[PDB]
User: Which sequence fits this backbone?
RNA sequence: CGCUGCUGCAGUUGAAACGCCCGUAGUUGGCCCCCCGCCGCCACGAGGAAACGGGAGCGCUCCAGGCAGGCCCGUUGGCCCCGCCGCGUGGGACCGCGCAGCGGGCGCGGCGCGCCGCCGCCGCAGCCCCGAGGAGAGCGGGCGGGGGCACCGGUACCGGCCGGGGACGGGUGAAACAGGAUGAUCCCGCCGAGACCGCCGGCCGCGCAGGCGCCUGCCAAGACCGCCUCUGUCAAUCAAGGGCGAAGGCCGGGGGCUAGAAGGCGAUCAGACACCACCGUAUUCCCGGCCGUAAACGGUGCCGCCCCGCGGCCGGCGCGCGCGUCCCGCCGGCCGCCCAGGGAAACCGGGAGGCUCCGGGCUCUGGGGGGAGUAUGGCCGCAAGGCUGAAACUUGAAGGCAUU
């Protein structure tokens, strides 16, 4: 069954980049996928993402500029202590300066670099580099 | 109470083959069968071949340990087809 | 050709399955049809599998099929 | 078929062994 | 290694096929793996056909053909040259050649 | 693999059951080896040599490797131990105390000595190496 | 994927984006609710009540024309099926295969389909019992199923 | 040593996907309401022995050390760390989870309040997410060697005849033992019995797998498809537990044609007791039970997602056109070839791809070769045996796929 909506969306995003296409359509729209796309858009990995209203579960059309290498989801959402937001950085992404792990925190769903400054720790949603 | 349900009467006697065979036949002999005439499960055996309904009150000829028998069920069916033909 | 998504071709969308589409939508419509005995128009489903009787001729005007309902008596066309 | 022939040989030893245990009960 | 995708048999969407026997060997062979060359020949050899055709007192009767499906087991087929052992390159060819 | 936040018990159980599959873990932690080892967890043990015997070399080497049949005192288990060095079997005499230590393969056999799991180290309370070098 | 078969098929129904009543349609909520109530008098199942409204009348979607689904209309009138129709329809099938099984004791294939159908009746009943759309006392047995139908 | 794998192993062929299907615990669950209540979660608190470890200062001659020392912060001997599922406060994303109508007034209900009532008392928009390329249910329309059950037809093989006619016939690699003036073989005319369903018959189809093919009639089902039908997550995989499961085998009956384990036999060959010829018992076949195994295979678990063209077939459905079993699509199944991608290659690409850039969910199994699927205990079976399942001990390779 479709347990992880994010994984299906992000694998489609990365498969479309690997062939190299300008628009991809994601079959299930989730407010968490919409937030994940937003963090990537702000950082500039992706462009405009459009949520078509199915009136059922909805769809998303994400415009791909071609700068994303690997975007993934860490499942189960694991619990990351603040004195471990750095341990995840080396195991998951390439170089401390390049790449972003998104972790949900009481403050919100934010990239690790922001959380490290706030001295907060959350639950990891996924890795986009 | 376990494998030898009705053959416990025999006790540790007569050997397994006889007791296993008796368990099939004796269960069938002591069973209640449906009257062809009254369609009620009250036919029981009085003697080998003689089966009487305790509701219909009708005596029918039958198998020694069953109201109907496999050779006889075949015969009625062949007779009906052949009778329909002639 | 620059044809893209979010704004796709209507003809191309029809060929695609109703649910495998940007908006899952009905493939069936209602039909305005006129019977031989009665000139009033009865609105019917295009894929009615139910036995449907004309408000005039007693016999059913609907013949049920695997896809679109076929009709037995006089036929009008295109509901408006 | 040396594997099928090994199994048969194993079986004709296990039945002999099962008989020997039965003599002593 | 796996020599052939087909596995030597044409079984698709099935778990069992009807057994047939080699005409020569008599080995039971599942219908899918049998060589199965149909032959339509003539009741008598061409060398005798001319003389039989002249002999008949009937107005227009041709030597009547004999139809038989020969089904052979793999070993019977390679020994009797019905099929040949081919190279890994030509093994894929499926069109009847020659 | 099992991937649930609440699947720690299953993962612990799998490791416990699967861990014994590796042969070295089973030798080390089952405890069958500790009972079986003629030297029970000891680095070495003392014994009396009943017979001085030579074990033919396994192929392809050809030699009469010299060995002693020794009855270890701690378990009263007779064993075969190689007497190392050239012509050093001469120092060993039957009915003589000896100390027997492993061949460095942890109970396995080394090279072409078939079924020899240990080497004599000291005969009559004097190290074999010292006798061959004529130190004592 | 089908619950009891290794079969994949998609033959669904695509409800329109518009949730608002169609222009040609002239039936007031009371007009169709009356049809639903008279169709319950005929005893027609809600799956058929919805189909009859769709084809003889032009109300393809009841909830679009009215504000509630067929069973919500029935429950408000207290005229809903005592046993939800889905379970009842499975129970008819279980008794029908069971009847055939009474004549033929060698249809092992038929017996297999019974285990699958019976398993659904148990699964849907546990959901229906938990939701309380079914009395908690309700038990589907099998021998007593003929009476339950 | 990533050879134990949470990070982070492997299971097509190296070791390893249970023969299949249902299924309870267990584990896992589409999307969805900004605001709180309880969670888990996370942040920082207190409060908790030193030694030790880390660490501040200090020349024990250096040093391992030790807390010393120098006319000195109140000269020092600071500070960090007990994993703490305890507690305190904050946050509230994520994560689950909340069935009950509210609200006004009375009213200071025994120092203030809530209860707890009582009055429609006229203030609430009072009280429904939606409708999953989730799932079940429905209707329709075709689909198939899917299942049962009865009925049946066709030769062929074998046997028993009537006639005919005349010397050999079988058998083989060549033979030989059988058969034949008791007239065989051969031919025809018949007849009995029991199996079996040819050619059509397949990159056909159906079934949960094992499997499925005479003719008629009957019965119940099943997948696929079409849909503006119903319900509203009813789901995914699964120990335990249930059912099924080729052949051979076993049991109690029936049946007995054909082949034919055993048995016997003729030829072989040094010897074959084997292959080949001949005769033949169990078996084959039916009904009622057992058994529970197969190279039960795609050597490839199941559900879900995107993924590149070019084909064929198959079952529905729709589009075009005058219009033909045409054409283009759509959905579902069976497949071929394959660009990337992957892999030790073979190869796979409807995956074995999207994976060292390693984490969608669930179960199963493996961990060098043997010993050994043995011993023993258990459970199961009438038995044969199945299922579970070691150790002592031995050993430097065993194995995969490629290349000369």
Assistant:
């Amino acid at each position: 069954v479709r347990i992880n909506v994010l994984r299906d969306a992000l694998k489609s995003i990365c498969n479309a980049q690997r062939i190299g296409k300008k628009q991809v359509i994601v079959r299930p729209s989730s407010k968490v996928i919409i937030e994940f796309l937003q963090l990537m858009q702000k950082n500039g990995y992706i462009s405009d993402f459009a949520v078509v209203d199915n009136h059922r579960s909805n769809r998303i059309v994400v415009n791909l500029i071609g700068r994303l290498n690997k975007a993934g989801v860490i499942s189960p959402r694991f619990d990351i202590p603040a004195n471990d937001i750095e341990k995840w950085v080396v195991n998951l992404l390439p170089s401390r300066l390049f790449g972003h792990i998104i972790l949900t925190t009481s403050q919100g769903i934010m990239d690790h670099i922001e959380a490290q400054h706030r001295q907060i720790g959350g639950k990891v949603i996924g890795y986009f580099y | 109470t376990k494998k030898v349900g009705l053959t416990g009467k025999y006790g540790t006697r007569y050997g397994r083959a006889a007791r296993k065979q008796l368990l099939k036949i004796e269960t069938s002999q002591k069973a209640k069968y449906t009257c062809p005439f009254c369609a009620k499960d009250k036919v029981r055996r009085t003697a080998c071949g003689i089966w009487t309904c305790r509701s219909c009150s009708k005596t029918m000829a039958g198998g020694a340990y069953s109201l109907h028998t496999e050779p006889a069920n075949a015969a009625r069916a062949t007779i009906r087809r052949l009778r329909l033909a002639r | 050709m620059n044809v893209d998504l979010l704004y796709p071709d209507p003809v191309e969308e029809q060929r695609k399955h109703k649910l495998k589409r940007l908006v899952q939508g009905p493939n069936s419509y209602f039909l305005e049809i006129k019977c031989a005995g009665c000139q009033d128009i009865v609105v019917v489903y295009s894929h009615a599998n139910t036995p449907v009787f004309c408000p005039g001729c007693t016999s059913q005007i609907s013949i049920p099929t695997g896809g679109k309902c076929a009709f037995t008596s006089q036929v009008e066309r295109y509901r408006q | 078929m040396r594997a099928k022939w090994a199994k048969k040989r194993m079986r004709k030893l296990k039945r002999k062994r099962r008989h020997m245990k039965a003599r002593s009960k | 290694p796996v020599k052939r995708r087909n596995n030597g048999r044409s079984k698709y969407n099935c778990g069992h096929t009807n057994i047939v026997r080699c005409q020569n060997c008599h080995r039971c062979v599942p219908k899918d793996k049998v060589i199965k060359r149909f032959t339509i020949r003539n009741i008598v050899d061409n060398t005798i056909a001319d003389d039989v055709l002249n002999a008949c007192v009937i107005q227009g009767f041709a030597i009547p053909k004999l139809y038989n499906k020969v089904q052979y087991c793999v070993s019977c087929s390679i020994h009797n040259h019905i099929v040949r052992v081919r190279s890994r390159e030509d093994r894929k060819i499926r069109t009847p050649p020659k | 693999k099992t991937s649930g936040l609440y699947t720690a018990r299953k993962l612990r159980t799998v490791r416990r059951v699967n861990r014994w599959a590796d042969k070295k873990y089973r030798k080390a932690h089952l405890g069958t080896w500790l009972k079986a080892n003629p030297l029970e967890g000891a680095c070495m043990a003392r014994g009396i040599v009943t017979q001085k015997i030579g074990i033919s070399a396994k192929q392809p080497n050809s030699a009469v490797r010299k060995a002693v049949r020794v009855q270890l005192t701690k378990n009263s288990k007779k064993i075969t131990a190689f007497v190392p060095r050239d012509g050093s079997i001469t120092y060993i005499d039957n009915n003589d105390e000896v100390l027997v230590a492993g061949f460095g393969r942890a109970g396995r056999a080394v090279g072409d000595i078939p079924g020899c799991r240990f080497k004599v180290i000291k005969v009559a309370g004097i190290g074999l190496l010292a006798l061959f070098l004529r130190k004592r | 994927g089908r619950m009891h078969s290794k079969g994949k098929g998609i033959s669904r129904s695509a409800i329109p984006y518009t949730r608002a009543p169609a222009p040609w349609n002239k039936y007031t909520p009371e007009d169709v609710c009356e049809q639903i109530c008279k169709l319950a008098k005929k005893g027609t199942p809600p799956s058929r009540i919805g189909l009859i409204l769709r084809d003889q009348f032009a109300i393809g979607q009841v909830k679009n024309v009215t504000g509630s689904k067929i069973v919500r209309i029935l429950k408000a009138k207290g005229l809903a099926p005592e046993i939800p129709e889905d379970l009842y329809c499975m129970i008819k099938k279980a008794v029908a295969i069971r009847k055939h099984l009474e004549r033929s004791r060698r249809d092992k294939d038929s017996k297999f389909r019974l285990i699958l159908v019976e398993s659904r009746i148990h699964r849907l009943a546990r959901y229906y019992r938990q939701a309380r759309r079914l009395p908690p006392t309700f038990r589907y047995k099998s021998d007593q199923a003929a009476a339950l139908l």
The first helix of chain C runs from residue 10 to 15. Chains C and F do not touch (no CB pair under 8 Å).
